[PDB]
């Protein structure tokens, strides 16, 4: 089958690239993942869709953005935001985010138009990750470390 | 050698039980894991040692605490705090925490002279984990879930 030429994911807290569909994954495909809030009573979540292999979204390519508001106040980590990345056989990417507390959903359709990447630009972004692989490895391992509470 | 009747670990952010030595592990043994700070410029970490199988430390048994202070200012998640659990065959547990940036360390010995690992106490805490197996499973997956940023004001 065809494949995703670049990894696709979302920005998670701290400017982290969190991939839902990995580079060279077979397409069509869909991946569904549950996300939650960063702070108590957080009223909305920022959904920014990125493509690329680097560990931090500042270094990847923004494909689309939307906000989901109206989240009921709750302790951090309790709201459940269901995100689905859905790629068709032509590579067209639909992203849906749904607040399971109320059922309010938001969605974007990301097409394959003129501002998108060519084979050579795709190839260059692959090179970029390899050059920064060791540094990006440390960023990802940092994201994965458990956090300890403060003293006093 | 012996085996650890209960899991041993520390409380991580949010009151979470993070086990470093799993129940039924052969002892003596040593386990090392690196942790980091929860907030920007966090100047110290509180090391709270817990025993038990439940997902949250409030449901497990507190064994002791110590603080490691003197962490230099840095963004949240940047300091690297190495924690090592070292247990001997009689269940005596040493916990050391070391700031890898400065080499500053602190350490505690958790003695095993109370009778705390009794058949009846071990049995209850193992049964509890089974009884709350589904609830603790959803809690652990909830903790592991990625977080989305807040929106522009």
Curated annotation (Swiss-Prot), chain A:
Compartments it resides in: Cytoplasm; Nucleus; Cytoplasm, Cytoskeleton, Microtubule organizing center, Centrosome; Secreted
Span list, region Substrate-binding domain (SBD): 2-116
PTM text: Acetylation enhances its chaperone activity and also determines whether it will function as a chaperone for protein refolding or degradation by controlling its binding to co-chaperones HOPX and STUB1. The acetylated form and the non-acetylated form bind to HOPX and STUB1 respectively. Acetylation also protects cells against various types of cellular stress.
Induction data: By heat shock.
Modified sites of kind Omega-N-methylarginine: 76
Disease: In certain aggressive cases of activated B cell-like diffuse large B-cell lymphoma (ABC-DLBCL), plays a role in the cytoplasmic sequestration of misfolded N-terminal mutated PRDM1 proteins, promotes their association with SYNV1/HRD1 and degradation through the SYNV1-proteasome pathway. HSPA1A inhibition restores PRDM1 nuclear localization and transcriptional activity in lymphoma cell lines and suppresses growth in xenografts.
Domain notes: The N-terminal nucleotide binding domain (NBD) (also known as the ATPase domain) is responsible for binding and hydrolyzing ATP. The C-terminal substrate-binding domain (SBD) (also known as peptide-binding domain) binds to the client/substrate proteins. The two domains are allosterically coupled so that, when ATP is bound to the NBD, the SBD binds relatively weakly to clients. When ADP is bound in the NBD, a conformational change enhances the affinity of the SBD for client proteins.
Function, as annotated: Molecular chaperone implicated in a wide variety of cellular processes, including protection of the proteome from stress, folding and transport of newly synthesized polypeptides, activation of proteolysis of misfolded proteins and the formation and dissociation of protein complexes. Plays a pivotal role in the protein quality control system, ensuring the correct folding of proteins, the re-folding of misfolded proteins and controlling the targeting of proteins for subsequent degradation. This is achieved through cycles of ATP binding, ATP hydrolysis and ADP release, mediated by co-chaperones. (Microbial infection) In case of rotavirus A infection, serves as a post-attachment receptor for the virus to facilitate entry into the cell.
Entry's family note: Belongs to the heat shock protein 70 family.
Protein name: Heat shock 70 kDa protein 1A
UniProtKB/Swiss-Prot annotation, chain B:
Annotated region described as Substrate-binding domain (SBD), given as residue ranges: 2-116
Localization in the cell: Cytoplasm; Nucleus; Cytoplasm, Cytoskeleton, Microtubule organizing center, Centrosome; Secreted
Modified residues (Omega-N-methylarginine): 76
Triggers of expression: By heat shock.
Modified how: Acetylation enhances its chaperone activity and also determines whether it will function as a chaperone for protein refolding or degradation by controlling its binding to co-chaperones HOPX and STUB1. The acetylated form and the non-acetylated form bind to HOPX and STUB1 respectively. Acetylation also protects cells against various types of cellular stress.
Family: Belongs to the heat shock protein 70 family.
Free-text function comment from the UniProt entry: Molecular chaperone implicated in a wide variety of cellular processes, including protection of the proteome from stress, folding and transport of newly synthesized polypeptides, activation of proteolysis of misfolded proteins and the formation and dissociation of protein complexes. Plays a pivotal role in the protein quality control system, ensuring the correct folding of proteins, the re-folding of misfolded proteins and controlling the targeting of proteins for subsequent degradation. This is achieved through cycles of ATP binding, ATP hydrolysis and ADP release, mediated by co-chaperones. (Microbial infection) In case of rotavirus A infection, serves as a post-attachment receptor for the virus to facilitate entry into the cell.
Domains: entry comment: The N-terminal nucleotide binding domain (NBD) (also known as the ATPase domain) is responsible for binding and hydrolyzing ATP. The C-terminal substrate-binding domain (SBD) (also known as peptide-binding domain) binds to the client/substrate proteins. The two domains are allosterically coupled so that, when ATP is bound to the NBD, the SBD binds relatively weakly to clients. When ADP is bound in the NBD, a conformational change enhances the affinity of the SBD for client proteins.
Subunit structure: Component of the CatSper complex. Identified in a IGF2BP1-dependent mRNP granule complex containing untranslated mRNAs. Interacts with CHCHD3, DNAJC7, IRAK1BP1, PPP5C and TSC2. Interacts with TERT; the interaction occurs in the absence of the RNA component, TERC, and dissociates once the TERT complex has formed. Interacts with TRIM5 (via B30.2/SPRY domain). Interacts with METTL21A. Interacts with DNAAF2. Interacts with PRKN. Interacts with FOXP3. Interacts with NOD2; the interaction enhances NOD2 stability. Interacts with DNAJC9 (via J domain).
Name under which the protein is recorded: Heat shock 70 kDa protein 1A
Organism encoding this protein: Homo sapiens
Lineage, highest ranks first: Eukaryota, Metazoa, Chordata, Craniata, Vertebrata
Location of this fragment in the whole protein: 395 to 537 of 641
């Amino acid at each position: 089958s065809d494949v995703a030429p670049l990894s696709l994911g979302l920005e998670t807290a701290g400017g982290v690239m969190t991939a839902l569909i990995k580079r060279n994954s077979t397409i069509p495909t869909k991946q569904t993942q549950i996300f939650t809030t960063y702070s108590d009573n957080q009223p909305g979540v920022l959904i920014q869709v990125y493509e690329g292999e680097r560990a931090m979204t500042k270094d990847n390519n923004l494909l689309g953005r939307f906000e989901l508001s109206g989240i009921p106040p709750a302790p951090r980590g309790v709201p459940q935001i269901e995100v689905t990345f859905d790629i068709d056989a032509n590579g067209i990417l639909n992203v849906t985010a749904t607040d399971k507390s109320t059922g309010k959903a938001n969605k974007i359709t990301i097409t394959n138009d003129k501002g998108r990447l060519s084979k050579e630009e795709i190839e260059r972004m692959v090179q970029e990750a390899e050059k920064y692989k060791a540094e990006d490895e440390v960023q990802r391992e940092r994201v994965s470390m458990y956090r300890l509470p403060n003293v006093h």
